Amino acid sequence: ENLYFQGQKKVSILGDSYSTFYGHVSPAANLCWYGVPGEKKENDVTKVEETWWYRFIHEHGFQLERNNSYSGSTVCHTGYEKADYSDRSFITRIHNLGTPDIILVFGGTNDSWAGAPIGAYQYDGWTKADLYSFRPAFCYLLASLKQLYPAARIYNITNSELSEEVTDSMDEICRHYGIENIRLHDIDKQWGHPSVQGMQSIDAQVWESVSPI
């Protein structure tokens, strides 16, 4: 039973703005949405201790391994205004998460908001071209995370208020790969990103799913 038998479990995050805070992401050059000097948001989160992940980690006996979160970043290679996000997409950052026991994937909001093509469910044979679309990219993501971190527990986190297609696709693909999908609900947002209240709700809802397992 005792925590010291196996030590604290190490949590890494592969995220977007919702999981960012200035000075607390790796690589440090990853774009952040919260806590950025001279880029004040109309959103009441001002301290890292209010973030969902900091709360989740410090409340439940975990240790932060890596917070690889990047503002605006998409799961697939298609960004905003059809920009090429091959330089920052989730699927390009999957090797830089340290040595986690737990991986929390929290993406897809930008794929939804940018209107990235949905494409086809695809469980092998991925080309770079294919990976500009959402379904092949998210399949490739889980498939690759499972191969790189075969001993880790991987949880997907689905933002509320995304397109039907992005929402349904992540749930179906999580089911294919046997990954738990945390379907967030009733998340208070300001300027399209969680508020202090919203961050608490995310923390609590992630813990609802992670606790039993």
- For Cl ion, which is the closer residue by CB, 149 or 169? 149
Rule CB under 5 A: is residue 88 a binding residue for Cl ion? no
CB of 86 to Cl ion, least distance (A): 13
Sign of CA dihedral 115, 71, 108, 75: positive
Helices and strands of the chain, counted as H and E runs: 6, 7
Distance CA 51, CA 193 (A): 11
Q: In this chain, which of 93, 110, 167, 193 binds Cl ion, going by CB under 5 A?
A: 93
- For Cl ion, which is the closer residue by CB, 90 or 132? 90
Distance CA 122, CA 136 (A): 5
Q: How many CB atoms lie within 10 A of CB 47?
A: 11
> Binding segment for Cl ion among 56-64, 86-94, 113-121, 203-211 (CB under 5 A)?
86-94
Rule CB under 5 A: is residue 148 a binding residue for Cl ion? no
Q: In this chain, which of 8, 46, 96, 99 binds Cl ion, going by CB under 5 A?
A: 96
Burial 195-204 (b: 16+ CB within 10 A, else e): bebbbbbbbe
- How many residues sit in the footprint of Cl ion (CB under 5 A)? 2
Rule CB under 5 A: is residue 46 a binding residue for Cl ion? no
One-letter amino acid identity for 209? Answer: S
CB of 167 to Cl ion, least distance (A): 26
- Which residues contribute to the site for Cl ion (CB under 5 A)? 93, 96
